[PDB]
């Protein structure tokens, strides 16, 4: 078996710079390789095959390169939407193994996050539940921390965040927060609060509402 | 004109099995080897073998020795890839991939065109459905050019549920949070931000969809 060695893990770059990401068979492997794209939640797409052959309707700005063991993978002059993860794969003889697969972002500049909070709605309280929500949207980089208020004093349990992947036309990421109690607890308490510290700001760009549910 | 169609989401029970199929056309299905590639979640891509269209016969990575096994059906031009006694370790999603040209055996080839893959989800967890909550904005907030909205997706198991907005017919300025699971339930999110000028009086619904469940809500945002 020959297994492929991939570097970097992950690249952050800007629009119009380059990028080089290497891939080393721990065997001969005459030039049987090829580079692949993949997107989030997408089938991986091939880039290039035969080390450095351009696959039909790929752009130019790719181009793959190397001989015996070593092998890179060339991106020359970033566009927004070349962010993704990208895989290299040997086929000399099987198994046909991939590389462990390198992470580009797209750098672009440090934005903060534009903050919405979300009192729980009429139905989900009938049925017992109260969730509060926060949007924390379009900002860069992904680095960013959230933390909820009742009354004042911080909560750090029943909290569940989830994260964008990069925005293909702007590069920011963003992110939910749901704070997530009874219908009870909800109601016996007033103000509520969703508290975002990220690199942009050196105080908590904040959000609140009181239980007028304003 | 090739393409390859892979069946639906999977949900089965440790020690259970799974069958995937995946559907060719295009081309001379007999002509090109057909690769089943793996990946588990946020991990990478693992190649698991290839089955040779014309003789039948499969070559299996050591890695998935024994418990997977690649069959055809040329008659409807498909390939299927069965695992038995599904572990944990074998959530993840399976890819079909034609090898892009053909003539030897003991070299491969780089792999073309490929399926949409599959979801197999391994656990003892119970199909249960959504719950779909407007995200209205608060009370004593306004003010402003653009006012975001959106719709809380609680309580669901398996994945996935599909969020639109306005049938699709809003795209730009929406966010849809990846599916989190907390306690065997899943929870997600989305939002949506339109003119303050356009909502509370044009309509504004988040389409939700939960497959599984034959779940379907549209619920219309609503101001408070």
């Known amino acids: 078996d020959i297994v492929m060695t991939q570097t970097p893990a992950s690249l952050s770059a800007s629009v119009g710079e380059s990028v080089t990401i290497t891939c080393k068979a721990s065997?001969?492997?005459?030039?049987?390789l090829a580079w692949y794209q993949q997107k989030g939640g997408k089938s991986p797409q091939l880039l290039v095959f035969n080390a450095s052959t351009l696959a039909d309707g790929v752009p130019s700005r790719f181009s793959g390169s190397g001989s015996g063991t070593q092998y890179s993978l060339k991106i020359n002059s970033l566009q927004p939407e070349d962010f993704g993860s990208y895989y290299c794969q040997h086929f000399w003889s099987t198994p046909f193994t991939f590389g462990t697969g390198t992470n580009l972002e797209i750098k672009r500049a440090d934005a903060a996050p534009t903050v919405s909070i979300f009192p729980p709605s009429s139905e989900q309280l009938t049925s017992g539940g109260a969730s509060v929500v926060c949007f924390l949207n379009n900002f860069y980089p992904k680095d960013i921390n959230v933390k909820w208020k009742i009354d004042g004093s911080e909560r750090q349990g029943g909290v569940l965040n989830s994260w964008t992947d990069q925005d293909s036309k702007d590069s920011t990421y963003s992110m939910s927060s749901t704070l997530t109690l009874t219908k009870d607890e909800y109601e016996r308490h007033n103000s509520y609060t969703c508290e975002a510290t990220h690199k942009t700001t050196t105080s908590p760009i904040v959000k609140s509402f009181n239980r007028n549910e304003c | 004109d090739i393409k390859l169609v892979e069946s639906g989401p999977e949900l089965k029970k440790p020690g259970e099995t799974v069958k995937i199929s995946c559907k060719a056309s295009?081309?001379?299905?007999?002509?090109?080897?057909m690769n089943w590639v793996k990946q588990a979640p946020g991990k990478g891509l693992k190649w698991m073998g290839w089955?040779?269209?014309?003789?039948?016969?499969?070559t299996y990575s050591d890695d998935f020795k024994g418990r997977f096994v690649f069959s055809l059906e040329t008659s409807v031009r498909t390939a299927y890839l069965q695992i038995n006694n599904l572990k944990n370790e074998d959530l993840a999603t399976y890819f079909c991939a034609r090898e892009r040209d053909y003539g030897s055996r003991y070299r491969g080839y780089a792999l073309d065109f490929w399926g949409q893959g599959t979801t197999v989800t391994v656990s003892s967890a119970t199909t249960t459905p959504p719950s779909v909550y407007p995200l209205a904005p608060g009370s004593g907030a306004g003010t402003n050019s653009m006012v975001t909205l959106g719709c809380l997706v609680k309580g669901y198991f398996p994945e996935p549920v599909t969020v639109t907005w306005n049938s699709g017919s809003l795209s730009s300025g929406v966010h849809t949070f990846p599916a989190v699971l907390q306690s065997d339930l899943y929870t997600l999110s989305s939002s949506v931000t339109v003119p303050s000028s356009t909502w509370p009086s044009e309509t504004v619904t988040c389409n939700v969809a939960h497959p599984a469940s034959s779940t379907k809500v549209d619920k219309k945002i609503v101001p408070r």
């Open positions: 065997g001969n492997i005459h030039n049987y």
């Open positions: 089955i040779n269209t014309y003789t039948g016969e499969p």
């Open positions: 295009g081309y001379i299905f007999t002509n090109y080897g």
